[PDB]
Structure 1
Amino acid sequence: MGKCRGLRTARKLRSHRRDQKWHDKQYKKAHLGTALKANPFGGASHAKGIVLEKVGVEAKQPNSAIRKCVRVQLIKNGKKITAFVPNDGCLNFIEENDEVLVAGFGRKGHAVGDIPGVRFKVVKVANVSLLALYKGKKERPR
């Protein structure tokens, strides 16, 4: 604790609370617009984008496996981002220039799992629902 308290200090605590609230990491970057600026989401819920390339990522230790991500430039955002590929046997559904609906994965701003720098996933590979592709409910028409 430790504060002034009187009958005119509404002027103080109006200044004092928010200026201490600016020290919050969650309050700062969300109100700097940097999450919109550094990340393509923050200003989108889903965003469609062209596959730049398919990136078969060997995982940095721990969790020894191969991640096999994909790299996407969005259309509304234009940001050359790398999205993780879930769904075993469905990196095969991806090509290059294979326009995908990307989403943030689970962290909304930082890396997940055993793999640094990747914070995105693809909802719809070829915009034809990779979930239904892994379920077999859809086939890739491309």
Structure 2
Amino acid sequence: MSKTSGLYTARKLRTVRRVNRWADKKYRKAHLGTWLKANPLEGACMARGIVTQKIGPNSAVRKAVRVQLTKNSKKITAFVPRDGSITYIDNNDEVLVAGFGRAGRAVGDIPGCRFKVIKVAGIGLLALFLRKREKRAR
């Protein structure tokens, strides 16, 4: 009918699928190569960087920081979620930055933020916000 169905027509089917499977946004983003080069994390679970400045229908200002990745030298912003953790981060402190739940895209009402802060001076943020450990060495 619309599609080919002859007994000697596998080549055309393979070619058609090869051509048409590039139309999916997800497949493109995963197999095209542009995102991997444009992603400052280069496919890594999380990165180690250096902070350099603190900044911050809902009308609540969210606290974040500007960071520069050691291995990449490009600039990004990562947002420190847990309450009272602004004071736990000081200018020019080594940090480890991961991603939000949605890879690539922004999450929530925060404009222009796509990362998270999970470690400072080598201590997990969660372990410090609950007072399990302490940052007396810095």
What TM-score do the two structures reach when normalised by structure 2? 0.90
Map of 2:15 onto structure 1: 15
Map of 1:125 onto structure 2: 120
Alignment pair present for 1:108 and 2:103? yes
How far off is 1:112 after superposition? 1.0
Larger Rg: 2
Write the distance in 2 (CA, Å) between the matches of 1:32 and 1:53. 34
> 1:46-125 residue pairs with structure 2 within 5 A?
46-56=46-56, 62-125=57-120
Change beyond 3 A, Cα 1:135–1:34: farther
> What amino acid is aligned across from residue 74 of structure 2 in structure 1?
K
Equivalent of 2:129 in 123, 134, 139: 134
Aligned length: 137
> What amino acid is aligned across from residue 37 of structure 1 in structure 2?
K
Write the distance in 2 (CA, Å) between the matches of 1:3 and 1:77. 48
Gaps of 5+ in 2: none
Checking the alignment, whether the CA contact within 8 Å between 1:35 and 1:41 is kept in structure 2 is: no
What TM-score do the two structures reach when normalised by structure 1? 0.87
Map of 1:59 onto structure 2: none
Identity %: 67
Larger mean CA deviation between 82-91 and 118-127 belongs to: 118-127
- Would you identify which runs of 4 or more consecutive aligned residues in structure 1 move more than 3 Å? none
Write the distance in 2 (CA, Å) between the matches of 1:34 and 1:120. 20
Larger mean CA deviation between 81-90 and 7-16 belongs to: 7-16
Write the distance in 2 (CA, Å) between the matches of 1:96 and 1:74. 15
Checking the alignment, whether the CA contact within 8 Å between 1:110 and 1:117 is kept in structure 2 is: no
> What amino acid is aligned across from residue 119 of structure 1 in structure 2?
R
Gaps of 5+ in 1: 57-61
> What amino acid is aligned across from residue 81 of structure 1 in structure 2?
I
